[PDB]
Scaffold this active site. Structure first.
Site, PDB file in Angstrom:
ATOM      1  CG  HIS A 151      -0.584   0.251   2.486  1.00  0.00           C
ATOM      2  ND1 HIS A 151      -0.389  -0.783   3.390  1.00  0.00           N
ATOM      3  CD2 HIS A 151      -0.313   1.424   3.102  1.00  0.00           C
ATOM      4  CE1 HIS A 151       0.023  -0.208   4.511  1.00  0.00           C
ATOM      5  NE2 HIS A 151       0.098   1.117   4.382  1.00  0.00           N
ATOM      6  N   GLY A 193       2.006   5.542   9.791  1.00  0.00           N
ATOM      7  CA  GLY A 193       3.434   5.570   9.512  1.00  0.00           C
ATOM      8  C   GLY A 193       4.170   4.348  10.038  1.00  0.00           C
ATOM      9  CB  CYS A 209       2.344   0.599   7.301  1.00  0.00           C
ATOM     10  SG  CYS A 209       0.683   1.104   7.800  1.00  0.00           S
TER      11      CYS A 209
HETATM   12  C1  LIG Z   1      -3.562   4.525  10.478  1.00  0.00           C
HETATM   13  C2  LIG Z   1      -2.844   3.324  11.039  1.00  0.00           C
HETATM   14  C3  LIG Z   1      -2.701   3.171  12.411  1.00  0.00           C
HETATM   15  C4  LIG Z   1      -2.022   2.077  12.910  1.00  0.00           C
HETATM   16  N1  LIG Z   1      -1.477   1.133  12.134  1.00  0.00           N
HETATM   17  C5  LIG Z   1      -1.571   1.297  10.814  1.00  0.00           C
HETATM   18  C6  LIG Z   1      -2.245   2.356  10.213  1.00  0.00           C
HETATM   19  N2  LIG Z   1      -2.572   2.202   8.851  1.00  0.00           N
HETATM   20  C7  LIG Z   1      -3.720   2.169   8.150  1.00  0.00           C
HETATM   21  O1  LIG Z   1      -4.776   1.775   8.624  1.00  0.00           O
HETATM   22  C8  LIG Z   1      -3.580   2.549   6.675  1.00  0.00           C
HETATM   23  C9  LIG Z   1      -4.009   3.986   6.393  1.00  0.00           C
HETATM   24  O2  LIG Z   1      -3.225   4.887   7.169  1.00  0.00           O
HETATM   25  C10 LIG Z   1      -4.307   1.517   5.826  1.00  0.00           C
HETATM   26  C11 LIG Z   1      -5.628   1.695   5.437  1.00  0.00           C
HETATM   27  C12 LIG Z   1      -6.293   0.713   4.717  1.00  0.00           C
HETATM   28  C13 LIG Z   1      -5.640  -0.460   4.371  1.00  0.00           C
HETATM   29  C14 LIG Z   1      -4.316  -0.612   4.732  1.00  0.00           C
HETATM   30 CL1  LIG Z   1      -3.446  -2.027   4.210  1.00  0.00          CL
HETATM   31  C15 LIG Z   1      -3.647   0.351   5.458  1.00  0.00           C
END
Ligand SMILES: Cc1ccncc1NC(=O)[C@H](CO)c1cccc(Cl)c1
Ligand SMILES: Cc1ccncc1NC(=O)[C@H](CO)c1cccc(Cl)c1
Lengths: 304, 304
Positions: B41, B143, B145
Site C-alpha cells: 500500500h 506511519g 506500516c
Molecule cells: C492509520 C494506522 C494506524 C495504525 N497502524 C496502521 C495504520 N494504517 C492504516 O490503517 C492505513 C491507512 O493509514 C491503511 C488503510 C487501509 C488499508 C491498509 Cl493495508 C492500510
C-alpha cells in the site's frame, strides 16, 4: 491506537555488552569507549558474599585477573578501579559500537528499559519503573548481574541502572553507573528491608489519559476533586501524594484530551474507592503505574 | 525471579529498518541481503485505498519511483515486484547488517516481538501474541506500516509479521514476509470483521506454571480435572479447547514444578469459575495469555 508496555530498541546497548570473569565468577559488563563497567561483586566467591571487604578483595587482583570477552574476542585490561559498588576496567581498545551516552541517576517513579543479559549475551528487553522504595520488579536470574537499564533520547543512551542483586523477596536492587545503590541496599548476602512501596500516582493518571486517548473511557465520571481531597484518598490507598509539579507534567495530556487534571483525579478516586467492577482499562484489570506522562506522550505521538 | 513481558533484543532487526517512499506515501521497509520488503500500500494515495487495484497502481511505477533510505544513505532500486501484499524492491547493495534470518508463518497463539518504527526509525519494542482470530493487539500509529514482528533463535531472526493495517476496532492486521495476510483481511479501507477471539488456554496454563516457579501459588487447589471436563469450562469462558498436543508442550513445566497438567487445569477451572477475588498473579489481575510454554521455559532458564 493500542497501548503497550514498550521498551526502547536495545540495539545501541547490545553493542556494549561484554562478559566479565574474575576467578570463578562471571557476570555482565558494559563497554563504553575504553572502559568496562561491571558490579564489583565479580571479585567475590560465595564465601566472600556474606560480609565482603571489597577493598581487601580487590587488592589481591591484578589487571590480568579480569577476563573481558566482547562476543568472541578478548579485551586487554590495562587498568582497574573501584568506584562505589562498580568496577571500571580500563581496556586498550575503545568499543567501536559505543553509542552517544550519558550516565544518569533516575528519580523513583521514572521508567527505563532493561536489557537482561547472561554471559555477556542479551536474552531480552523489558520496560519497568524504579519503585518509590528504590527497588525494581524485574526478571533476572543468577548471572544477570551487570545487565543495565536505560532511556534513549534521539541518538543518546542515558544509562541509569546496573543490576546487582536479588532481595529475599524476589525484587531487584542495583546501582547508577557510578556504583551508587538506589535505596538503602548494600552489596552483601544479608536480608535487607526494601521498605514501604507506594503506587506512582502521576503515572496511573498518565495511563488513564492514555486509556482515554485509545478509547477506554468507561471510568470517566461527572465528578471533580481538589489536590487535598484526592491526597486523602491517595494516603488511604498507599498512593504517592500528588503535587502541583505532577499536575504540571500532566499538562500536555490534559490539553490533548480536554480533561482537567483534577477531573481525572476524581476518576482515579472513584476507581480506588470502587474498584474496576470486573472491567478492564488498556487490557489491565488493575491501575497501571509503569508509564510516566513522558512515556504516554512519546508512545501516543510515535517518537523515534 | 520475577516474570516480565519480555521481548527479544531488537538490535538485529534495527539494522534492517529502512524508510520507503513512493509518491506521497512513506512507510517502513525491511532490508535483508539485496531486497527491501515493505507493504504494497506504499504505492497508494488516500483516494486509492478505498478499493485499490494494486496491479494497475504498480504498473504506473518504475524503480526510480521507490525512494529507499537506510539511515541517511540512499539505496539504488534495480528491480521491483509484488508478492501477495508485499513489495520486494531489489537494491544494488546487500545490507551489511543482515542477520542470519528465516521467513516463518506463525500459528495463532504464538508470540513474537514487534519493533515499532516510523520513517524507518525504531521507536520501541514489545512482545505480543498472534490472537486466535489472527489480529494482534499492538501499539501502532499512522506511519508504523512495514514494522515487523520476529522471534530469535541463538543468531537467527525468524521474521513472522509485517504490519499493514489498523482495523476500525483499533486492533492490528498484517502479513507474513511473503505478503500473505494472517486472517481474512484485505489491504483496503473497508470495515472488516476480525471474528470471535478466544483466550489462548495453553498460554494461560504456561503462565500459571511461571507464577508457581516465581512464588505466586495462592491459586493452587486440592482438585484435579479431565480434558473433557476442563474443555466444558473452557467453552463456557471463550477459552480455546485444550488438546493432548497442548498437554505435551506443557510437559517441561509440569516436570519442573511437579504439578500435573490436569491439576493445573483444575486451578485454571476454579480461577475461571470464581475469579481472582481481588488478588493478583505475577502482577496481573487477569489471566495472561501472551506467554507460550516455550517463552516460560526460556525466561525461567535465562536463554540468550
Ligand atoms: C492509520 C494506522 C494506524 C495504525 N497502524 C496502521 C495504520 N494504517 C492504516 O490503517 C492505513 C491507512 O493509514 C491503511 C488503510 C487501509 C488499508 C491498509 Cl493495508 C492500510
Ligand atoms: C541470584 C540472583 C538472581 C537475580 N538477580 C541477581 C542475582 N544475584 C545475587 O543475588 C547475587 C548472588 O548470586 C548477590 C548476592 C549478594 C549480594 C549481591 Cl550484590 C549479589
Amino acid at each position: 491506537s493500542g497501548f503497550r508496555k514498550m521498551a526502547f530498541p536495545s540495539g545501541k546497548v547490545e553493542g556494549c555488552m561484554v562478559q566479565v570473569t574474575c576467578g570463578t565468577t562471571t557476570l555482565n559488563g558494559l563497554w563504553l569507549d575504553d572502559v568496562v563497567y561491571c558490579p564489583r561483586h565479580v571479585i567475590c566467591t560465595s564465601e566472600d558474599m556474606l560480609n565482603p571487604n571489597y577493598e581487601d578483595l580487590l587488592i589481591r587482583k591484578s589487571n590480568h585477573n579480569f577476563l573481558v570477552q566482547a562476543g568472541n574476542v578478548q579485551l586487554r585490561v590495562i587498568g582497574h578501579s573501584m568506584q562505589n559498588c562498580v568496577l571500571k576496567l580500563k581496556v586498550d581498545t575503545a568499543n567501536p559500537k559505543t553509542p552517544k551516552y550519558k550516565f544518569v541517576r533516575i528519580q523513583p517513579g521514572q521508567t527505563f528499559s532493561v536489557l537482561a543479559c547472561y554471559n555477556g549475551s542479551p536474552s531480552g528487553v523489558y520496560q519497568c519503573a524504579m519503585r518509590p522504595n528504590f527497588t525494581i520488579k524485574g526478571s533476572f536470574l543468577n548471572g544477570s548481574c551487570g545487565s543495565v537499564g536505560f532511556n534513549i533520547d534521539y541518538d543518546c543512551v542515558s544509562f541509569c541502572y546496573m543490576h546487582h542483586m536479588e532481595l529475599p523477596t524476589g525484587v531487584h536492587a542495583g546501582t547508577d553507573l557510578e556504583g551508587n545503590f538506589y535505596g538503602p541496599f548494600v552489596d552483601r548476602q544479608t536480608a535487607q528491608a526494601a521498605g514501604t512501596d507506594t503506587t506512582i500516582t502521576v503515572n496511573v493518571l498518565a495511563w488513564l489519559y492514555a486509556a482515554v486517548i485509545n478509547g477506554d473511557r468507561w471510568f470517566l465520571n461527572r465528578f471533580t476533586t481538589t489536590l487535598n481531597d484526592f491526597n486523602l484518598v491517595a494516603m488511604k490507598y498507599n498512593y504517592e501524594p500528588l503535587t502541583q509539579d505532577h499536575v504540571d507534567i500532566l499538562g500536555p495530556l490534559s490539553a490533548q484530551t480536554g480533561i482537567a487534571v483534577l477531573d481525572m483525579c476524581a476518576s482515579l478516586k472513584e476507581l480506588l474507592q470502587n474498584g474496576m467492577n470486573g472491567r478492564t482499562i488498556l487490557g489491565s484489570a488493575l491501575l497501571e503505574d509503569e508509564f510516566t506522562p513522558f512515556d504516554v506522550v512519546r508512545q501516543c505521538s510515535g517518537v523515534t
